[PDB]
């Protein structure tokens with residue numbers, strides 16, 4: 001099930017541009033590999049800000065010793081799919097609720 005929200009090869013800059021492109025809106029997101037840490041991922045989400053407005057925010061997805069994933073140590077997940085579904089249901093600390101995957 002090749003997940004639409006997973007962009008393997010895509011830099012931090014690419015993600016911001018791709019997300020800010022026409023067709024995407026508030027809550028659009030994508031998960032990419034981190035540039036700082038090889039083997040980890042980042043969640044890039046498009047949020048509506050007060051000043052300039054349209055901005056892209058990046059969250060680090062940290063790995064658990066047993067194989068899980070989490071953004072905040074308070075809620076962990078057995079995989080990326082579950083992390084995406086959880087934040088799609090409720091922002092739960094995130095800048096905004098995850099909505100529709102990034103469109104090209």
Ligand SMILES: CC(=O)N[C@@H](Cc1ccc(OCC(=O)O)c(P(=O)(O)O)c1)C(=O)N[C@@H](C)c1ccc(OCC2CCCCC2)c(C(N)=O)c1
Pocket residue numbers: 012033034035036037042057058059060071072092093094095
């Ligand atoms: C400059 C910048 O964009 N910083 C990001 C974090 C970040 C992401 C990726 C990379 O490199 C990697 C790359 O490839 O860009 C780096 P870096 O290695 O270049 O420094 C830093 C940020 O502060 N975003 C906010 C929105 C953010 C805000 C709060 C956070 O936790 C608090 C909890 C609160 C409850 C809900 C869950 C979050 C987190 C976070 N966990 O990181 C992130």
